[PDB]
Amino acid sequence: WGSSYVNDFIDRGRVKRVYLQGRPDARMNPDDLSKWYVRNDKGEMVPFNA
Amino acid sequence: IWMFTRIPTAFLPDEDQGVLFAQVQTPPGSSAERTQVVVDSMREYLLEKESSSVSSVFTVTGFNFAGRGQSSGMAFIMLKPWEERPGGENSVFELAKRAQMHFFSFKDAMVFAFAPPSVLELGNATGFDLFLQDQAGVGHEVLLQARNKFLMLAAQNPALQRVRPNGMSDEPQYKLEIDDEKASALGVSLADINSTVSIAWGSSYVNDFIDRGRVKRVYLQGRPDARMNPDDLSKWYVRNDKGEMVPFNAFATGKWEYGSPKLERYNGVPAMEILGEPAPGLSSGDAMAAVEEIVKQLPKGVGYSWTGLSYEERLSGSQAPALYALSLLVVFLCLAALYESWSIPFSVML
Amino acid sequence: EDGSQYPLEGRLEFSEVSVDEGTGSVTIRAVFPNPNNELLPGMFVHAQLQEGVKQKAILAPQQGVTRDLKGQATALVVNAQNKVELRVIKADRVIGDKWLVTEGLNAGDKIITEGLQFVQPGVEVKTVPAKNVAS
Amino acid sequence: EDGSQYPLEGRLEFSEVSVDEGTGSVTIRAVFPNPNNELLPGMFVHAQLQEG
Amino acid sequence: IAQVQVQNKLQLATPLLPQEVQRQGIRVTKAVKNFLMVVGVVSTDGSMTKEDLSNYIVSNIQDPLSRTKGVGDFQVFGSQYSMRIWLDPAKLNSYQLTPGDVSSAIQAQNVQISSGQLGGLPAVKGQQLNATIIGKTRLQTAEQFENILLKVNPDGSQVRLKDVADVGLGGQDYSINAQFNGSPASGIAIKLATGANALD
Amino acid sequence: ASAETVQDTVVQVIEQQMNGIDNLRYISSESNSDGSMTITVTFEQGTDPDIAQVQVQNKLQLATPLLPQEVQRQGIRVTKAVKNFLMVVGVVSTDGSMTKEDLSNYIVSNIQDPLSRTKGVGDFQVFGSQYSMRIWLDPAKLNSYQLTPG
Amino acid sequence: KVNPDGSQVRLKDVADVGLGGQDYSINAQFNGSPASGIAIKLATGANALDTAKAIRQTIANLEPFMPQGMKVVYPYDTTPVVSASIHEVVKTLGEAILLV
Numbered sequence A: 001w002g003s004s005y006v007n008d009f010i011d012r013g014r015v016k017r018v019y020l021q022g023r024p025d026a027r028m029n030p031d032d033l034s035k036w037y038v039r040n041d042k043g044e045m046v047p048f049n050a
Numbered sequence B: 001i002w003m004f005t006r007i008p009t010a011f012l013p014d015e016d017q018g019v020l021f022a023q024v025q026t027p028p029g030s031s032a033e034r035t036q037v038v039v040d041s042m043r044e045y046l047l048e049k050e051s052s053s054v055s056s057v058f059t060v061t062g063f064n065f066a067g068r069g070q071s072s073g074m075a076f077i078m079l080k081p082w083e084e085r086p087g088g089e090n091s092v093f094e095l096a097k098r099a100q101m102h103f104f105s106f107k108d109a110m111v112f113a114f115a116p117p118s119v120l121e122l123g124n125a126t127g128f129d130l131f132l133q134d135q136a137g138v139g140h141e142v143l144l145q146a147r148n149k150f151l152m153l154a155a156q157n158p159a160l161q162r163v164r165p166n167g168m169s170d171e172p173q174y175k176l177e178i179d180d181e182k183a184s185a186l187g188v189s190l191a192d193i194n195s196t197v198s199i200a201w202g203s204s205y206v207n208d209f210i211d212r213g214r215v216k217r218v219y220l221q222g223r224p225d226a227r228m229n230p231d232d233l234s235k236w237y238v239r240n241d242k243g244e245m246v247p248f249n250a251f252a253t254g255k256w257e258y259g260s261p262k263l264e265r266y267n268g269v270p271a272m273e274i275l276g277e278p279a280p281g282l283s284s285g286d287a288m289a290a291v292e293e294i295v296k297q298l299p300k301g302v303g304y305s306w307t308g309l310s311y312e313e314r315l316s317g318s319q320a321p322a323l324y325a326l327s328l329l330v331v332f333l334c335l336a337a338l339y340e341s342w343s344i345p346f347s348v349m350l
Numbered sequence C: 001e002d003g004s005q006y007p008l009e010g011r012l013e014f015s016e017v018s019v020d021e022g023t024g025s026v027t028i029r030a031v032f033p034n035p036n037n038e039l040l041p042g043m044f045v046h047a048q049l050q051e052g053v054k055q056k057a058i059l060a061p062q063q064g065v066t067r068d069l070k071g072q073a074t075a076l077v078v079n080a081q082n083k084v085e086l087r088v089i090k091a092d093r094v095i096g097d098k099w100l101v102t103e104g105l106n107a108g109d110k111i112i113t114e115g116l117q118f119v120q121p122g123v124e125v126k127t128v129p130a131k132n133v134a135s
Numbered sequence D: 001e002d003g004s005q006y007p008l009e010g011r012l013e014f015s016e017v018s019v020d021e022g023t024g025s026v027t028i029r030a031v032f033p034n035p036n037n038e039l040l041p042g043m044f045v046h047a048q049l050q051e052g
Numbered sequence E: 001i002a003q004v005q006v007q008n009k010l011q012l013a014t015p016l017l018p019q020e021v022q023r024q025g026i027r028v029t030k031a032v033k034n035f036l037m038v039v040g041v042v043s044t045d046g047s048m049t050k051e052d053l054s055n056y057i058v059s060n061i062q063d064p065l066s067r068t069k070g071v072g073d074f075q076v077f078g079s080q081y082s083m084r085i086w087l088d089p090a091k092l093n094s095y096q097l098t099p100g101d102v103s104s105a106i107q108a109q110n111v112q113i114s115s116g117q118l119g120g121l122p123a124v125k126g127q128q129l130n131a132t133i134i135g136k137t138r139l140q141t142a143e144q145f146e147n148i149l150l151k152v153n154p155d156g157s158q159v160r161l162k163d164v165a166d167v168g169l170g171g172q173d174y175s176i177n178a179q180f181n182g183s184p185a186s187g188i189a190i191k192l193a194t195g196a197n198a199l200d
Numbered sequence F: 001a002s003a004e005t006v007q008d009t010v011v012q013v014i015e016q017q018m019n020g021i022d023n024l025r026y027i028s029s030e031s032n033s034d035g036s037m038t039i040t041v042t043f044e045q046g047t048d049p050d051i052a053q054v055q056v057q058n059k060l061q062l063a064t065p066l067l068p069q070e071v072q073r074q075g076i077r078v079t080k081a082v083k084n085f086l087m088v089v090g091v092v093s094t095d096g097s098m099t100k101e102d103l104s105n106y107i108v109s110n111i112q113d114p115l116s117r118t119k120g121v122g123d124f125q126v127f128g129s130q131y132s133m134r135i136w137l138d139p140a141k142l143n144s145y146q147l148t149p150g
Numbered sequence G: 001k002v003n004p005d006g007s008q009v010r011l012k013d014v015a016d017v018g019l020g021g022q023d024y025s026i027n028a029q030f031n032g033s034p035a036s037g038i039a040i041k042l043a044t045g046a047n048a049l050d051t052a053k054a055i056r057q058t059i060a061n062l063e064p065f066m067p068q069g070m071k072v073v074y075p076y077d078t079t080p081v082v083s084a085s086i087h088e089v090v091k092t093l094g095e096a097i098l099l100v
Helices: A030-035 B002-006 B032-048 B092-105 B140-154 B180-185 B191-200 B230-235 B285-295 B308-318 B320-339 B343-348 E002-016 E050-066 E089-094 E099-109 F049-060 F102-116 F139-144 G049-060 G079-099
Strands: A004-011 A014-022 A037-039 A045-047 B019-024 B054-063 B068-079 B112-114 B128-133 B160-165 B171-178 B204-211 B214-222 B237-239 B245-247 B252-259 B262-266 B269-271 B273-278 B303-306 C011-013 C029-031 C059-061 C065-067 C073-078 C084-089 C093-095 C098-100 D011-013 D029-031 E037-042 E071-076 E081-087 E114-117 E132-134 E149-152 E158-160 E165-171 E183-192 F024-032 F037-043 F121-126 F131-137 G015-021 G027-030 G033-035 G038-042
Touching: A004 E081, A004 E099, A014 E099, A037 E089, B019 B032, B019 B092, B032 B054, B032 B068, B032 B092, B032 G027, B092 B112, B112 B160, B128 B140, B128 B285, B128 B308, B140 B160, B140 B269, B140 B273, B140 B285, B160 B285, B180 E149, B180 E158, B191 B214, B191 B237, B191 E114, B204 F131, B230 B252, B230 C093, B237 F139, B252 C065, B252 E132, B273 B285, B285 B308, B303 B308, B308 B320, B320 B343, E002 F049, E037 E050, E050 E071, E050 E081, E050 E165, E050 E183, E081 E099, E099 E149, F102 F121, F102 F131, F102 G038, F102 G049, G049 G079
Parallel strands: A014 E081, B171 E132, B214 F131
Antiparallel strands: A004 A014, A037 A045, B019 B068, B019 B112, B054 B068, B054 G027, B128 B269, B128 B273, B128 B303, B160 B273, B171 B252, B204 B214, B237 B245, B262 B269, B262 F024, C011 C029, C059 C098, C065 C073, C073 C084, C093 C098, D011 D029, E037 E183, E071 E183, E081 E165, E114 E132, E149 E158, F024 F037, F121 G038, F131 G015, G027 G033
């Protein structure tokens, strides 16, 4: 949700940036925050609202 | 008025100053010892053949005024003091032209020799200097095509001499492509590949250490036997995730390309600059007129930009008639102030 | 591993026709006589093979052949009428200080190795034997 | 693996319909003649194949 | 002198900041509010948004008017392009991946690597060949970005960065949104350089 | 790094801000393949060089981390370099027993900063470098002991 | 790396460590013999002769601390042309005033 800026990349000689964020419809309502998953130490994907 | 417009223009007439500069550029891709074998030869030539005028030569390899790299090398020639070299044959200009005449025997490198101007703080060589700016945004190769056309056109003009590019010609390079798909499929990562290719060739500086009370650096690089040829690229190994070593040529290979080693820019727009001295006898202003009439014929889309002492000379030649006009105006006008009429200053200005 | 050569000499035989999945490499085997137990099992060594012998080879000096302009290797040679002309070649392997050119060069050809900065292809040029190699 | 083409075309027959959960991919299988043993088992290759 | 003093204080203060804001870069200016003028570029037919208009301003328009006489400084509404990568949570859940893995894979597979030279110094005695090595370079198009390998398996199966996410050139920031008579536009405010006539 | 790496990243991260400086005459940038770049901006006469140096100093910090952060470890050098050199020093003795490295080490270690703290010495350029503990790796024994340079 | 049975491998065999140079790009010769130098650029707005005398003094004070197998020369200098130029112009000033 915070648009992390990763590093830079070349575009037509100029040095632009590359950002990272989710899809728009993935972050619009509070229950959409339950749509994101995180891998535990054993390899399963825990949901967020757990 | 005819005698006035017949006189050629110049700026700061040349003085001896007892110094000389020389610079060599071996063909691109040549190693350092190939440049060493020509700088020591021209050094011993200046030492034994011109013992009348020089005092000592001090040469460096790796760096000159036109750039830096393995295919470059310069030499400062400090001459004898003045009364030890009497006569015009022992001046820096006569020695410069006769050493330049001898230097065409050196078929290996494109060695040039010149002198700095009368002031040392305005450049370090006489003659003109101009940039070939690409104002229309044309490609890089058409600019060096125009530069080569300009060089072959100025070589046959009997007004100029020692016309050289202050850059360097293009050079073959070695692209190293890495199939990351097969490399990752074999089990090895990519960050360790990047690290070992940046350490084994790139000579990574790791941290500091103390030596004799002084902080110094410590570097890391492969041995010189392991990085000399492209197949030595196959002599390096990376450890995969399973713990075994996989060679570098199992996933990577190479290719030959062609790129320029030194690139410059003038006022935000790319350019390559050309230097040159006028031929003996004539001035520098008619030499600039010659490069004007030879830069009229050029590929379209690029222009010339004056710089340095040539730019200063152009401004000094431009700002002169207003100086003359305001000067004789104020002397006429203060002379009418002191002599209380207009008629005798109007007669005495004549 | 110290760099010293083993005094005796051994032969080889092929014993593993399958390439390894992880390493991506094929292993072969050799037999060596060890009369004084100078070799121990587990020692790291460097074998030296023999992958054929080129009979009518040709070795160009590195000072005479250069790459150019998204292309292959080129070399300037003078013809019988002393006119310099460029020829493309396919040199890829480096032997010592020479290139092993496969095709595009023949024996008796006179390759330019000194004086490239003052010449373009198509110029009448006089010839002198150069001083760049030990020979 | 070196990008060179192979002279002899082969034949495809399907042998695995169970998509792996780790990468979302299925494995399909093909046969190839190998007369003079220029192919070895266990090397990375890129097989081109046909569709509509 | 006031600007360089404030900039020096901020410059020795900047290691106290976190990493993701000091990689953003602090911008210190002397601007008060006054401008010579402001000139806007408007997309009348609706073919462009604000972001590509500001990108055209940064790429094509920024250099010549900065090269003109009497122009001190300027500021632009909006900024240039960026490589936006929109992540999808469902396919990350399917491929058992977290966004930290995507960030680490991008940081591994989009770099510039100093790879030295063939006949670099100190060379062996008798070496006659020397050439720079062009190793890994940064990716340029979106298609080079979308083929980034996130995970592979030794049988050859792989997950790339083209199903689990959506790459494309977009804007660096989407907070500001301006338009000109309804039609979208982006502009630049230009001040006068100290010691210059205004009309010329 | 090569000349194409430093072509339009470090040059065109600076040269767009370098226009608009007071009484500017011209800007000239240059980049090499051995990994160096130099940008010389020059102004007309009459201006004192310290206010021009602090103007360039407050202008180039608009994009100081926008260049690659690894070369920031070396730092951007800002210098009022004039055009040329005044004098050079330093030599071997007649007895030999010195290479061309230990002389440069002794110059840059013992006599360099006492030379540079004297009056009027605005810049220096030393041929050679200091000592550094070079560690030459062998790839064969790295393959032997299952180690990487990392 | 060290295994727990006492076996070990150090940075003695896999590499060789030598107190070498930091950058092997540029190197200098004086009359054929190998040497090294440092060219000094004068500061903006500073006199040349007093600074050259200061350079000679700050060489002359610490030259006793140099080893026996070392020496210092001045391969390239520009102050004698300034001294000779001002000497020539005061000489032609004296000749001109006596001639007048």
